[PDB]
C-alpha cells in the first residue's frame, strides 16, 4: 500500500521511531518519502543480485533474505517479503537494527543527500498526530 504522509508518520510514531536513538520522527518520514514515496511494495534491483525492499528500501544482500541473493547475510533475520507488507512492523524493526550500527541513519544514502542536516521536523509539521 501507499501511505499518506501523515498516516505514515502516525504509524511510525506508533511503532516507536520518533526519537529512537536520537532521531526525531521527521527523519524517518523524510527518508521513506525519498526512498519509496511511502510505498510498502516498492522494490529496486541493484548491480549485484540484491534488491531493495519496502517503504525504506532495505537491501537483500545484508539485511533480509529472499532466497536468491549472492552473499546474503540476513542481518535482520527476516524474509525480504516481510518488508513488502502493508503492515510496517517488520520494516521498522529492521530499520531500528540498521540505525543501531555505529554509522546510524547514514546507511540510507537518500537520507544523507536529502534529509540529513535539514529541518526534517517539516515532514511531520502539519500532521495531527
Amino acid at each position, epitope marked *: 500500500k501507499v501511505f499518506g504522509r501523515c498516516e505514515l508518520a502516525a504509524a511510525m510514531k506508533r*511503532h516507536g521511531l520518533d*526519537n529512537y*536513538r536520537g532521531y526525531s520522527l521527521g527523519n524517518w518520514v523524510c527518508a521513506a518519502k525519498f526512498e519509496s514515496n511511502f510505498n510498502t511494495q516498492a522494490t529496486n534491483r541493484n548491480t549485484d543480485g540484491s534488491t531493495d525492499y519496502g517503504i525504506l528500501q532495505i537491501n537483500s544482500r545484508w539485511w533480509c533474505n529472499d532466497g536468491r541473493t549472492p552473499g546474503s547475510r540476513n542481518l535482520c*533475520n527476516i524474509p525480504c517479503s516481510a518488508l513488502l507488507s502493508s503492515d510496517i512492523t517488520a520494516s521498522v524493526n529492521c530499520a531500528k*537494527k540498521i540505525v543501531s*550500527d555505529g554509522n546510524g541513519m547514514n546507511a540510507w544514502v537518500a537520507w544523507r543527500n536529502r534529509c540529513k542536516g535539514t529541518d526534517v521536523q517539516a515532514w511531520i509539521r502539519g500532521c495531527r498526530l
Partner: antibody
Amino acid sequence: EVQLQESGPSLVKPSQTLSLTCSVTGDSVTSDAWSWIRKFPGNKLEYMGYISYSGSTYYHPSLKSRISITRDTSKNQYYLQLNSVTTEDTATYYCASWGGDVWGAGTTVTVSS
Amino acid sequence: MDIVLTQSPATLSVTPGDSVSLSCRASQSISNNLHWYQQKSHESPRLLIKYASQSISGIPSRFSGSGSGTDFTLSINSVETEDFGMYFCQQSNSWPYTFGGGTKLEIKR
C-alpha cells in the same frame, strides 16, 4: 541452530583485567550484532555494551573507560575485556545476540585477592 | 540521565491458573521500545515480548504485552506451573540500554 557459550577465568584479582570469550556456533559472528550483559547479586542487570555486525561498538557510559569488546571472524568468537576490576565487578556474565533471541548459559566471574 | 525502569510489585505470589499483570514504568518516554524477559532460577534470561507488544514466534500465547510511552504491562493469561521466576523489562530507545529491577513471580500456598 545458533548457540552461544561463555568461557574465561572465573577468578580475577582486584585491579587486574577480566577477560571472557563467547563462542558463536551454528552461524557466523558476522551474521549479527552481539552483546555482553552482567547480573549483579540482587537481580540487578546491566547491559555492558554491544559490537555490531560491522565491528563498531557501543559501550555503557558507566564502563566506557574500562571496557573493550572485540571479535574474531576466523574463530567466530567475540570478547569482553574489563580493566581495573574491583569486588563490585563480581557477577554472572552472559553473552547474547543484539536481538536478545539467543543467550549463552552465562558464567560467573569473581573478583577477589 | 540514563533511563530508569521501575517495576512493581517487587514480588507477586499467585496460584497456577490465575492471571497476572506486571508493571514497568520508564522515567522518560520510550514509545514502544520496551522488551520483556523471563529468567528462571539457574537459567539465562529469555525474551518473551519485543517492542512492547509484538509476539515472538515460539513463546506461549498466554504471554502478551501492552502500553506505550512510559507505562507498560506484561500479562500472563493463566500462569502455568513452569512460569515462576523473575521478570524484567528493558528499554532500547536510548543508549545505554537499561533494565528494570524485576518482578518475582512466586507460588501461592
